[PDB]
Write an enzyme that holds these catalytic residues in place. Structure first.
Site, mmCIF file in Angstrom:
data_model
loop_
_atom_site.group_PDB
_atom_site.id
_atom_site.type_symbol
_atom_site.label_atom_id
_atom_site.label_comp_id
_atom_site.label_asym_id
_atom_site.label_seq_id
_atom_site.Cartn_x
_atom_site.Cartn_y
_atom_site.Cartn_z
ATOM 1 C CG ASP A 36 -0.136 0.081 2.386
ATOM 2 O OD1 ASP A 36 0.795 -0.651 2.666
ATOM 3 O OD2 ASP A 36 -0.597 0.806 3.531
ATOM 4 C CB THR B 287 -2.278 7.262 -0.415
ATOM 5 O OG1 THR B 287 -2.900 7.375 0.690
ATOM 6 C CG2 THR B 287 -1.185 8.453 -0.242
ATOM 7 C CB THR B 288 -1.564 4.619 -4.644
ATOM 8 O OG1 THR B 288 -0.978 4.259 -6.070
ATOM 9 C CG2 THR B 288 -2.723 3.909 -4.518
ATOM 10 C CG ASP C 137 -11.688 -9.632 4.114
ATOM 11 O OD1 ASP C 137 -12.910 -10.392 4.111
ATOM 12 O OD2 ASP C 137 -10.622 -9.734 3.678
#
Lengths: 500, 494, 505
Positions: free
Chosen positions: B45, B78-79, B356
């Protein structure tokens, strides 16, 4: 060393040499393009404006650069125009896809995409092609004269422009027999003015010393034909050579009334200082041929060819209508007019300034071609880089409607069209961006034939400014440009094998 | 050699974005973060990549700083906020190399983003209502694609969506907020994973609390304790007196967490109380906050009414056990998913697939205004801004056009990282959003995004691929701000 | 050691502008009447000193092809004017130097070029506006002295410049075809003889051939109309019979000539002169061994024409002679041929017998330039006041039209103004005054007072008024200059790339 191996190493240097040879015909597009100056080595500075006459005399030494100039050698041999456009557009087809090949595209894919975009481009030109041929062109020709005015509108010679136009539409239409620029060979003369410039149905040539002897000829003559000679006219056993030279000097006078010519035309010089010895023959002469003055009067008047010292023929004084020889601002010019096969009309360029000689050779030599193509072709479209913009918008709308690898490339086709108007305005002097965004806004919303103005550098409507362009000419132009593009893309290896 | 600080900054930002390029998406590869001091770091990440990257260039540090300002808002993205900004830098450099001033490109980027957010807000999705559940259960199902539970995982999808909607906290502002701890993980030894079912509270395989309480102990007052109830040598011998004292304050079901009592066999019938050793302090606070029960270590005096309510504690055989059903309590923290199988080991990655799967649907139900994921928004926005640029006609007409290609870099990188064709899927998705514009009746071909797993043109609204609209809007805003700031640092030969 | 070939086409314009401004404005110190005479050294054997621009820019050899194009078109401008081309070259350098700043400011050179053309379209018509010309100049033989004043007043020939101007008043008048008004290649007023002095160049409207005589005791003072020109070339007892045959070939001119008519029949080639002594008893002279192309040169002096052949020399087409005289053509050297006896000369030409190349070179060519500006007293009798006086007024008017003009043409006109202002600057600089202050003061005097004939006092006279000093050019002599400067400044700005065949990349 530079990337001399297979694949994308080979294509990069090829596109680089393509851009290098595009630089030499870049600034020559448009009617107000820049002038290229090349000097031959020995000192022949050639200020030239047309891209083809640059391209014949250039420094084309590269493998890939030679495979563009031949495709242009086809295109200027077909029509004699569009040579710099089919090189700039072809180089831009490579340059727009140049970042696409090294990112992992196959060359045959971007060839096939070029071909389907070219097929849609040669489709869409015809559905917007307009025929204006029946609408008052051969009869009621003045509309045809109106687009004759486009090369000299709103200028300082605009007053004599209609005077030029009414004569040059005749220079098309009195001679429209699959016309050639050889049929209309124009001649500059110092003195006079632009009102006094004229167009003879025939030829007009100045007499120099080595050109032609006798002033004040039998002009008012009802069968003046010429004799196309090839031999001279002018001037212990030591007495015998003098008796031989007297004999030859009298032997030259035997083609005069036996052969019976009024003008003889050899290629050897004549003496105008001693004109009366050749006016002892009392007939006019001509020497030191130009090949234009040769073959124009040959294909028009049709005098016989002679070599013999007593060569009598039937076309020494055959059927030609008239001769004229008049001072032109003082300067006496021949006129071998009055011809039975007269595909010959010489424009007398009368005027004070010599430097307008290029002007009618830049504007009116292209204006005669504009109305010649407006007669010879009928499906016309706009000029000024509007048709390429319509093709770019249509290909842009097509590319987003198709999935696959071509979706970039056809779009990479479309921007590659837009080298046409951007180089036009930059050859005029305007900003490239504000002439393009203001173009494309109303071009993508309002209409099709909004193009680039050359006079005040704004967005104009060239369909109403009568900047026509023949549709098939544009078709063959961008077809040759796309073919020259995919020819370079398909090249991946140059085997040299130099010496043995 | 180098002559413009703008080219320097676009190269710095591109070298920053290249490291977070192949980590964007759920199939991102590892960027090994080894510094020269000897550390070895493996991650996937961009937050941990950039936050511990030894960045070299100052403008690259400015881009990382603005990515950190994005990082404090929504977490992820963010990427993307690095990559879209870097492509804006690159296309802006390509524009200003064509004699275009960066002022015009900056204002064009600003107008493009201002038009793009109104394009987004006209075409968002609020299908995830209380009526939107088939799309929600389909989101739950496709969030756990290609897993070993997935046949019975459809039954887990049946039991996870009512788990997230039914226990849902209306907060102090009256809005739905799902705590993940409200459904608690709970194994089940013995029977295999093909029957696992959510039960409405916690049921620990522990020591039995009592035998003198009924199935339904209706009005409980949980005296949750800490101490071990033993004799020594208000009570000093802590066995009876303070137990009966807090029961006289009303303690119905006392919950001793410590060791057992010697006489609770007599007290657990008259009061009906429990004794479970080593109650999980997470679940102890959770069932405490589900009831409103004061935890007391000692009891020297709250006790009157702040011992909390449980409606029913069954003493029966579930999990092949006498399960203690702390359930049906006052506040909505009462649920625990059972996990059949042999242990928490065979279904361990299945348990991880359950957790998840809770965590993806809580992100959907919070911030109910939602857009499809899968990069459909970026391709649709490029198709939008392509015609919006031609609508303008100003000097910035190219800039919005260069906003278009710089937006589809996210589905391009998703097609890269998913081991698929890069440009072909972006071309297909761009083609599918064309008939979202030209074809008037096919407005419902709009959310056709990319498959985040296998990389194919696919539905998202039916597939349940969703992302909150405030996340996408704020990421586009911060990417444009980063691009404008680094394009502004231009006027140096450096 | 990795040589480049790219010419960055804006910087290539800077390179061409500095390559011009090396060759152009080298001659900036030769401008005006007080210019500095350059040295001309040929690469084989020549050393000369001259101030005339058309001599040096032809005879100098430049390196760059831009300046090669400059002198190549100025060679045609020599056929246009043939006078004051140094002003064209200085204006070329001035307009290119001013265009360098506009090329730096962002203007395309096409816009600079046609803005210069549009400014010339202001300056030429303003020059037509300030024309305070004298119009009586046909029979103005005393005003024709001050017409031909300053073209000769720069030397010590001013003692005989009155006579040298009266040369011109007879020169222009007999060539004044009062409709066509032309001096031609055959109407040339040039025949220079080496050795002598100032007034040794004087009025003889005749043919002066420096051949030998028929005999050292021949009667040289003939009056005859019985002159001729026959081209008789040289074209062992048999060789003696051949000499008898050459005798009888001469006898075509001896015994078979009283029915034919060739008495003063001078000869061209080889011959034995005792048959010409037999002619001396006949008293029919024959100058031996004459040249080739001097035949129409000598067959004009009664208005007739050339006979270079035997049989066409009849009585109507004899040899022809000008006007009777008895003067020693050569004082210590030989008397030349008297081809001056009988009648008028159409190809009329002045006796020039100086000994110094400066005064003779200017007197042949500047009198032909007078025969252009007195041609510009009959072709268009319209004169202007030079010396920078007109160049200030047209610079004022071009800057006036540079106030209400659209954008980049307006910048081109405001560069055109101070590019035209160099003709005051250089002409004041070569005199020996301050180049910038003297221009501003007389420009102020030309703008507060309405007189446009206020030039720069570079003759170092009293006042700055060009009227009383009569420093006078024509409307054509400056109109042609300005237009032919702008028409090649546009050419140099249109030329961007010079690739060199004999290719070197």
């Amino acid at each position: 060393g530079t990337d001399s191996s297979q694949g994308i190493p080979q294509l990069v240097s090829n596109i680089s040499a393509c851009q290098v040879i595009a630089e030499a015909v870049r600034t020559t597009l448009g009617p107000r393009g820049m002038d290229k100056l090349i000097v031959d080595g020995r000192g022949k500075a050639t200020i030239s404006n047309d891209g083809a006459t640059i391209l014949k005399l250039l420094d084309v030494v590269h493998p890939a650069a030679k495979t563009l100039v031949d495709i242009a050698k086809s295109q200027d041999a077909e029509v004699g125009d569009g040579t710099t456009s089919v090189t700039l557009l072809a180089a831009e087809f490579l340059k727009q896809v140049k970042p696409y090949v090294e990112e992992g595209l196959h060359p045959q894919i971007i060839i096939r995409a070029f071909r389907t975009a070219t097929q849609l481009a040669v489709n869409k030109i015809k559905e917007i092609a307009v025929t204006v041929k029946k609408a008052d062109k051969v009869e009621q020709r003045k509309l045809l004269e109106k687009c004759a005015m486009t090369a000299l509108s709103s200028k300082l010679i605009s007053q004599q422009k209609a005077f030029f136009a009414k004569m040059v539409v005749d220079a098309v239409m009195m001679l429209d027999d699959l016309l050639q620029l050889k049929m209309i060979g124009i001649k500059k003369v110092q003195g006079g003015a632009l009102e006094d410039s004229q167009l003879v149905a025939g030829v007009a040539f100045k007499k120099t010393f080595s050109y032609a002897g006798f002033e004040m000829q039998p002009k008012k003559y009802h069968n003046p034909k010429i004799a196309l000679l090839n031999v001279e006219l002018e001037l212990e056993d030591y007495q015998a050579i003098v008796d031989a030279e007297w004999n030859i000097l009298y032997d030259k006078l035997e083609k005069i009334h036996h052969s019976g010519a009024k003008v003889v035309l050899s290629k050897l010089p004549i003496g105008d200082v001693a004109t009366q010895y050749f006016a002892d023959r009392d007939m006019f002469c001509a020497g030191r041929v130009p090949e234009e003055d040769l073959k124009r009067t040959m294909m028009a008047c049709g005098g016989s060819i002679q070599t013999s010292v007593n060569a009598l023929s039937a076309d020494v004084l055959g059927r030609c209508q008239v001769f004229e020889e008049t001072q032109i601002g003082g300067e006496r010019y021949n006129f071998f007019t009055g011809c039975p096969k007269a595909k010959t009309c010489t424009f007398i360029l009368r005027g004070g300034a010599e430097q307008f000689m290029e002007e009618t050779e830049r504007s009116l030599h292209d204006a005669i071609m504009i109305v010649r193509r407006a007669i010879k072709n009928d499906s016309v479209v706009a000029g000024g880089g509007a048709i390429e913009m319509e093709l770019s918008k249509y290909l842009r709308d097509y590319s987003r409607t198709i999935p696959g690898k071509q979706q970039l490339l056809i779009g990479a086709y479309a921007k590659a069209l837009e080298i046409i108007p951007r180089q036009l305005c930059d050859n005029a002097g305007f900003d490239a961006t504000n002439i393009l965004n203001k173009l494309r806004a109303r071009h993508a919303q309002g209409g099709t034939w909004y193009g680039v103005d050359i006079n005040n550098e704004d967005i104009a409507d060239n369909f109403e400014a009568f900047v026509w362009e023949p549709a098939m000419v544009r078709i063959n132009a961008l077809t040759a440009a796309s073919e020259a593009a995919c020819l370079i893309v398909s090249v991946d290896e140059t085997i040299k094998n130099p010496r043995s | 050699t180098g002559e413009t600080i703008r080219s320097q900054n676009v190269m710095a930002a591109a070298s920053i974005a290249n490291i977070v390029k192949s980590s964007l998406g759920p199939v991102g590869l590892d960027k090994m973060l080894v510094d020269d001091i000897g550390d070895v770091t493996i991650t996937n990440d961009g937050a941990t990549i950039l936050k511990l990257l030894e960045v070299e260039h100052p403008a690259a540090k400015v881009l990382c700083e603005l990515a950190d300002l994005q990082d404090k808002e929504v977490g992820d993205g963010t990427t993307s906020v690095v990559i879209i900004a870097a492509e804006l830098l690159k296309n802006a450099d390509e524009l200003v190399k064509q004699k275009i001033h960066p002022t015009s490109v900056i204002s064009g980027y600003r107008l493009a983003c201002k038009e793009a957010v109104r394009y987004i807000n006209e075409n968002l999705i609020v299908n995830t209502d209380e009526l939107g559940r088939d799309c929600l259960i389909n989101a739950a199902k496709t969030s756990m694609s290609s897993k070993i539970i997935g046949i019975n995982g459809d039954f887990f999808a049946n039991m996870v969506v009512d788990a997230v909607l039914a226990i849902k906290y209306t907060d102090i502002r009256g809005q739905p907020r799902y705590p993940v701890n409200s459904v608690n993980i709970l194994k089940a030894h013995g029977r295999s994973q093909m029957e696992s079912m959510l039960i409405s509270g916690y049921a620990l395989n522990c020591v039995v609390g009592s035998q003198g309480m009924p199935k339904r102990i209706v009005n409980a007052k949980i005296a949750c304790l800490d101490f071990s109830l033993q004799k020594t040598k208000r009570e000093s011998d802590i066995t009876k007196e303070r137990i009966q004292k807090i029961l006289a304050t009303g303690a119905n079901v006392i919950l001793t967490t410590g060791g057992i009592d010697d006489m609770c066999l007599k007290y657990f019938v008259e009061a009906g109380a429990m004794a479970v050793r080593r109650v999980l302090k997470r679940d102890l606070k959770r069932i405490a906050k589900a009831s409103g029960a004061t935890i007391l270590s000692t009891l020297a005096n709250f006790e009157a009414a702040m011992l909390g309510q449980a409606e029913e504690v069954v003493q029966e055989r579930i999990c092949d056990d006498e399960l203690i059903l702390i359930k049906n309590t006052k506040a909505r923290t009462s649920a625990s998913i059972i996990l059949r199988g042999a242990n928490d080991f065979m279904c361990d990655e299945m348990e991880r697939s359950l957790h998840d799967a809770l965590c993806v649907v809580k992100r959907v139900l919070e911030s109910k205004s939602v857009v499809p994921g899968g990069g459909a928004v970026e391709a649709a926005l490029s198709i939008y801004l392509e015609n919006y640029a031609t609508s303008m006609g100003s000097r910035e007409q190219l800039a919005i056009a260069e906003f278009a290609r710089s937006l589809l870099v996210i589905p391009n990188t998703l097609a890269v990282n998913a081991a698929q064709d890069s440009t072909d899927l972006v071309a297909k998705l761009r083609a599918f959003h064309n008939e979202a514009q030209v074809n008037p009746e096919r407005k419902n071909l709009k959310w056709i995004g990319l498959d985040l797993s296998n990389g194919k043109p696919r539905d998202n609204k039916q597939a349940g691929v969703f992302e909150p609209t405030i996340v996408k809007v704020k990421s586009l805003k911060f990417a444009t701000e980063a691009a404008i700031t680094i394009l502004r640092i231009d006027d140096l030969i450096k | 050691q990795d040589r480049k070939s790219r010419l960055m086409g804006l910087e290539a314009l800077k390179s061409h502008i500095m390559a011009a401004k090396a060759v152009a404005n080298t001659m900036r110190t030769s401008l005006g009447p007080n210019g500095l005479d350059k040295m001309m050294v040929d690469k084989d054997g020549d050393v000369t000193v001259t101030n005339d621009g058309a001599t040096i820019l032809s005879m100098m050899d430049v390196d760059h092809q831009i300046a090669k194009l400059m002198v190549e078109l100025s060679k045609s401008q020599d056929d246009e004017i043939g006078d004051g081309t140094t002003g064209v070259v200085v204006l070329a350098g001035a307009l290119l130097e001013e265009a360098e700043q506009l090329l730096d400011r962002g203007i395309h050179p096409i816009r600079i070029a046609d803005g210069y053309e549009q400014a010339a379209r202001v300056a030429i018509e303003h020059l037509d506006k300030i024309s305070d010309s004298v119009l009586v100049d046909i029979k103005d033989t005393e005003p024709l002295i001050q017409t031909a004043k300053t073209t000769l007043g720069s030397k010590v020939v001013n003692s005989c410049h009155r006579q040298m101007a009266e040369i011109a008043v007879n020169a222009v008048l007999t060539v004044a075809d009062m409709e066509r008004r032309d001096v031609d290649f055959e109407l040339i007023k040039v025949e220079g003889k080496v050795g002598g002095r100032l007034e040794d160049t004087k009025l003889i409207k005749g043919v002066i051939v420096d051949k030998d005589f028929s005999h050292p005791q021949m009667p040289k003072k003939v009056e005859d109309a019985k002159i001729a020109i026959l081209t008789c070339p040289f074209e062992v007892e048999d060789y003696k019979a051949l000499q008898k045959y050459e005798k009888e070939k001469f006898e075509e001119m001896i015994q078979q000539i009283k029915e034919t008519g060739a008495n003063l029949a001078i000869c061209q080639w080889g011959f034995d002169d005792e048959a010409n002594h037999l002619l001396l008893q006949n008293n029919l002279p024959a100058v031996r061994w004459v040249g080739g192309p001097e035949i129409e040169l000598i067959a004009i002096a009664t208005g007739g024409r050339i006979v270079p052949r035997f049989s066409e020399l009849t009585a109507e087409k004899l040899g022809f002679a000008g006007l009777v005289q008895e003067i020693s053509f050569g004082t210590t050297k030989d008397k030349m041929l008297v081809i001056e006896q009988c009648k008028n000369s159409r190809a009329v030409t002045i006796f020039i017998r100086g000994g110094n190349k400066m005064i003779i070179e200017e007197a042949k060519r500047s009198l032909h330039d007078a025969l252009c500006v007195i041609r510009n007293l009959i072709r268009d009798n319209r004169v202007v006041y030079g010396g920078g006086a007109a160049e200030i007024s047209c610079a004022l008017a071009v800057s006036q039209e540079a106030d209400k003009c659209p954008t980049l043409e307006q910048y081109a006109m405001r560069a055109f103004a101070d590019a035209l202002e160099v003709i005051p600057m250089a002409l004041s600089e070569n005199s020996g005054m301050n180049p910038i202050q003297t221009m501003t003061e007389v420009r102020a005097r030309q703008v507060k007072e309405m007189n446009p004939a206020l030039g720069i006092d570079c003759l170092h006279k009293g006042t700055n008024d060009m009227k009383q000093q009569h420093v006078i050019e024509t409307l054509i002599g400056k109109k042609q200059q300005i237009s032919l400067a702008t028409q090649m400044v546009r050419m140099i700005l249109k030329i961007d790339d010079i690739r060199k065949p004999g290719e070197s990349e």
